[PDB]
Design a protein around this ligand. Structure first.
Ligand SMILES: O=c1[nH]c(=O)c2nc[nH]c2[nH]1
Ligand SMILES: O=c1[nH]c(=O)c2nc[nH]c2[nH]1
Lengths: 214, 217
């Protein structure tokens, strides 16, 4: 049970910790973790019945297994904490899977996947948030063209449906967030706030608090 | 509490789940998490009182703060789950920090697969987060490179696991969460061709299981 209050300075306090950069609390760790574990069950239930290219035994089609696992591509740097939690829940539900990473920046690709045999494989992208939809459209087109997967789906921790600029509907969504700048649980302002266990909205203008390049 | 036993086939069972690839249990999730948080407290206690280059106020020196955080470089892919947990414990202890990533591989000789994107580490306290120190060659390569290319004020290493018997070059990380036996470990980031990373516990691998997945991913 989380204790949420405001101190005399009007600042949000969660379990004794003050968040002076926060406007509102979106989700506590308990709510976030329950939502991720629920989507993990959905992903495991959806993929465990499926089959795809057998690269372990030289063809043809074979069930998703430890021999031929679901391929997960995690988008760095935003999705690493979400990914770490999600994979452990996928393991709890017994879904065979392997994870590789691509790195994008604001588009530029900074780091490519090292996986080289995704042709005819079921591929799932783990992403932090779908807001405008532009980042995912860039990643999806790149992965489809270079890897030619059997299927390509997207699981996001957060959906901000009010921010869309292009058509993007993830296949799996853990949480819906307000039409505001969110921080915490991987969400950042110049790499700050990613380690928070809860998700908050940012006080307006605080997005410029750390102008110095790291 | 965890229950650890062997079933009628002699297979290790932890909390109702069988681990047929495992030879021995090294650490349960509870022991791992307690050990990471304890080191997080040590890291926070060590860095909290220190100062380094001020890149926020373009000044000289300032305390470690959200304006001038500790710089953490996490070594992919093995350290990503460990890093996710450690940063949350570091936040619990109030240590201001930011995380970037590098990736290295061996051909054994070392090569950089992915570079960090941080470009202002000169005069900064830098902490490397690595999954394991075994031979010491991977960390010798990384420390020599970060020191020469970034000129940090200080450079320290935190490892989830130390395999002391594996050393071929001198390497003692400043912070160690767990000490592992001199064997192939799996679980909590440790893997066989990317399998077993999602396990919440760390185990030793049965000797005949290391070549179970020969196909490149
Ligand atoms: O920190 C962040 N907060 C957001 O709300 C967001 N939307 C897209 N990308 C984002 N990053
Ligand atoms: O999975 C792993 N187990 C080990 O024991 C090890 N040592 C170095 N790198 C390693 N990876």
């Amino acid at each position: 049970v989380h204790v949420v209050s405001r101190n005399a300075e009007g600042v949000i306090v969660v379990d004794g910790k003050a968040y002076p950069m926060a406007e509102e609390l979106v989700a506590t760790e308990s709510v976030i973790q329950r939502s991720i574990k629920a989507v993990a069950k959905q992903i495991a239930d959806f993929y465990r019945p499926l089959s795809h290219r057998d690269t372990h035994g030289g063809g043809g089609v074979a069930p998703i297994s430890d021999e031929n696992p679901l391929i997960i591509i995690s988008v760095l740097k935003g999705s690493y904490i979400f990914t770490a939690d999600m994979v452990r829940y996928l393991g709890d539900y017994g879904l065979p899977h392997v994870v590789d990473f691509l790195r994008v920046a604001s588009m530029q690709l900074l780091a490519e996947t090292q996986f080289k045999a995704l042709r005819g494989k079921h591929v799932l992208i783990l992403e932090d948030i779908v807001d405008s939809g532009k980042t995912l459209r860039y990643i999806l087109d790149k992965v489809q063209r270079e890897h030619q997967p059997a299927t390509l789906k997207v699981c996001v921790l957060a959906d901000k449906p009010g921010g869309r600029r292009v058509t993007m509907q993830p296949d799996f969504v853990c949480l819906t967030v307000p039409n505001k700048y969110v921080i915490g649980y991987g969400f950042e302002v110049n790499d700050r706030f990613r380690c928070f266990r809860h998700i908050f909205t940012l006080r307006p203008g605080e997005a410029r608090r750390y102008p110095a390049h790291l």
